[model samples]
Target: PDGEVDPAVWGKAYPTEYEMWKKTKSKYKRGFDADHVTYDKLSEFPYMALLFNGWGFGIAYNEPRGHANMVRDQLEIDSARLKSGGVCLTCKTPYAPKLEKEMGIDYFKTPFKDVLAKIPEKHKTLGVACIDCHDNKDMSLRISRGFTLGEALKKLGVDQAKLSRQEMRSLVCAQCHVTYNIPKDADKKSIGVYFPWQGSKMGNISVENIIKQIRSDASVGEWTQTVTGFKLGFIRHPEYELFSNNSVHWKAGAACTDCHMPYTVSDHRVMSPLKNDMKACIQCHTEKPEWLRDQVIAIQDRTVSLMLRSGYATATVAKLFEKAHAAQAQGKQIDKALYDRAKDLYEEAFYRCVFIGAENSVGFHNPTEAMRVLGDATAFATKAEALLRQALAKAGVDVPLTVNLELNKYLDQRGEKKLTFDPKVEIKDPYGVQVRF
Candidate 1:
């Protein structure tokens, strides 16, 4: 059988699912209900501008749309965002595996725009299609991003051949929902994407393990922080990592599709559960729709609260690094040992903050785990700031009680698209427990 990547062709046989997929075109607000405006992440949490400075994300980062817009959204973003090139398309398009097989390493090294040109015209718009999570011959659940995911699972000693159908449901989403790093060649060009699950085993792909694997890899590269002058690794949406094992929903045996692609009771149509009025939750919780929605808002409110605190703390550490580096450059007698330790701590703090920031759930996926990581993020950044202060004091440099972050400087550095936060739009918090600075 010929390889068909078109959703329309799949729709010829399963019209209901295809029609529901198309309905995902409707946009949603950051608060998670159907809305018209896309959320600008940098403007909402201004600390990102300082923390991710000198990185592609610093230029522009927006809330993700539905699966329908995955490829379209990637193509629409500022070119700086796609600096990783064609390898960046792996998560967004069904054709990633096919192109990787046909073109080898060249597929990853090719310019992103060039890869777009290489995509057959008819399949240009296809994203996360039937072929991505299903076998064309039988429509059984399958994992298409095997080069990275399948191998990563093998490292964990999880036998893919023995995985139950229930496991395959989540594994399909895990194909793209997990965090990965693109290894850089000697020339500093990306060779391919690899999941940082090398040291992790089954039931333990935690943020700590992922960071450990990242530290062990010398070729892994992401972005350099302008403020700190340190090249640091990055984390993408690690939904599968954060939500697996010990999470309430996971322990309850629920898969991603159970929530994200819930079936309608009446029409039997499978559609996005995100804005379906909490239909997914009501099925199990039996709570009133409004009550369930409020509970989720409360969870997300707390997560965002800690996320901002950790982000600002990490940003403060970056600013302190800039100060220390400037003083040292001017022939100041800074303690090299203490300064290096502070840099190490800052890297840890930054990565932890990013782990939560990039996860699409707003921390509802695993509130307890999210809070734990964020708590450590803030604590580590605070310690780094303390150490950097000691180093500056040893150099006899007077440190300010309040460091000027120059928020406006980075906030105004918009790239191809200028996106800003909306003050009038209320972030609905029913519990009134969200910590406000």
Candidate 2:
């Protein structure tokens, strides 16, 4: 066992960021990410605990106060405790493919807890590492696993290995970061992964594009509101897929690394997992560093404000839907058609809210599209509220409805809100203390 490890695989051998850079990143994170909010903080906040009840988000995101490992913990606690099986663990560790290869996908159907427990002792804390995105023998980028490439990507008629080296860079990331749904109906025998656009054009894989598939399947979410007993669809983050389609940068040829791991060419095609500097804009803006930074900040601000405003609308409609569902579930003789209409409204508004909520980027990936989606969400929520009011009126309770999205309440207290981006900008315990992220 002395030197049995794959020489090419970084595995746990990857070097950590040097000491000084580590200290600086930590300091910046504390300052800029002071607003860092997470899901477990929901119970402390009003409305959210009830609305998001039964969802794995709160638990999946509850990775201790400062856990900071490769995210294997989150996978076990949330995905394992909840419904997702072994497949969800793929992106959390480098040993994932090896496990699937030796034990097979059926292991994927095993309880996440047991799967993790049984993982070979050597990979216990391997975490997300270099072998995840590159070949052990060749330095070229690679896609480890998942539907984004196997089928959904293949449907696009582009076999990744045949693409240019630059293109491979993103395919590797897409292997884990794309929007996809875990099907409830598939056989546990071999239901490895499911992408909505598997056999179709994939239509750019935008939020709306995925919506069409989820809507057509009519099998997602399906949870009863713990308080109201209303079952509806649940949505999860789909940022990668959403950003891939119709993105301003993508259309112009920017890859995942463009903004996230951006670089300057006075030097290189660039490499920094940090995704930094003025080089990205320098190629397109021809302006000074500060100006480019300022413009980018403006873009993010608009994106956040619009997201919050639109989020509020969805929450308001949600309250209305809850009330309507409550009345019906309790056996009131409400107009069936009106009840159905209200539910449909809730679904439309809910999809919008969830899109904004689940998307980690808050729209920076496609600010224009994000804003448009939110705008439509707000309108639909308003309409849903009106219909809900009529339903309540028919039930002999005529009262003004209180509509407020108040999505920001979920943001962490004083969690970094300045301009630009920085994973290092987050803070600890930014919960309930207000200002939702």
TM-score for predicted model 1 compared with the true structure: 0.86
Clashes (N, CA, C under 3 Å) per candidate: 0, 17
Model 1 residue 201 distance off true place after TM-score fit, in angstroms: 2.6
Q: Tens digit of lDDT per residue, candidate 1, span 305-380?
A: 8877787778777877888889978988778789888888887888888888888678878888988999898888
Per-model TM values vs. the true structure:
0.86, 0.73
TM-score of 2: 0.73
Question: Candidate 2 local accuracy as lDDT?
Answer: 0.53
Q: For residues 139-254, what per-residue lDDT tens digits would candidate 2 score against the true structure? A: 45767674335666776666655777766656666776665565554332224555655434432665565666777764454355553455555455565666766778767777
User: What CA RMSD would you report for each candidate?
Assistant: 5.1, 8.2
* Candidate-wise lDDT, in order: 0.72, 0.53
* Local error of candidate 2 at residue 184 (angstroms): 2.9
Least accurate 10 contiguous residues by lDDT in model 2: 26-35
